[PDB]
Amino acid sequence: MNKKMINGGTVNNWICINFSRQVQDNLARTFCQELAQMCYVSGMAFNPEPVLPPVSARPEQVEKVLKTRYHDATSKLSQGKEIDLLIVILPDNNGSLYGDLKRICETELGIVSQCCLTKHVFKMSKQYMANVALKINVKVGGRNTVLV
Numbered sequence: 001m002n003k004k005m006i007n008g009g010t011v012n013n014w015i016c017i018n019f020s021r022q023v024q025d026n027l028a029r030t031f032c033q034e035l036a037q038m039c040y041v042s043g044m045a046f047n048p049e050p051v052l053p054p055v056s057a058r059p060e061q062v063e064k065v066l067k068t069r070y071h072d073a074t075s076k077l078s079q080g081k082e083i084d085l086l087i088v089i090l091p092d093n094n095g096s097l098y099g100d101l102k103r104i105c106e107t108e109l110g111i112v113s114q115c116c117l118t119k120h121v122f123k124m125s126k127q128y129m130a131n132v133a134l135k136i137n138v139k140v141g142g143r144n145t146v147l148v
Contacts, residue, residue, distance in 0.1 A: 006142075007043075008043035008045060009138075010140065011039065011136070012047050013085075014083065015069060015073045015083060015087070016029075016032045016086070016087040017054065018054055019057055019059050027122075028089055029053070032087055035087065035133065038126070039133040043142075044136075052076065059097045067104075084112065085113070085136065086113040088116065089121055091117075091118055092117050
């Protein structure tokens with residue numbers, strides 16, 4: 001057996017920010033589409049299209065890009081709605097970027113974020129996507145099986 005979604009969460013409204021210089025915007029797009037698809041077929045409600053296209057940003061600009069893209073997506077949503085998920089593409093070795101971003105999303109924006117390292121973004125293996133989908137599901141309040 002492998003873990004499965006018991007209850008799938010709902011991601012109606014999501015965006016993507018990329019921080020890796022190896023990743024072009026259409027690769028970020030493709031990656032997020034594959035992930036969206038995996039989440040869906042696993043049992044989530046998951047919008048195949050983001051609120052805004054993916055943006056590439058310098059790690060140095062983490063606070064400004066998050067807050068700016070958050071405000072812009074969030075302004076674009078029908079009234080009374082919020083961003084369900086931020087998908088973040090990170091460099092494999094990113095130093096303090098990971099901690100800073102989680103701090104900002106958790107304590108400043110109040111948005112669930114899922115980070116994905118560059119090396120995996122290139123490979124897009126179904127096993128990786130399935131694993132990330134499982135992670136996303138529980139973060140947005142879904143339920144997964146256990147194996148033990």
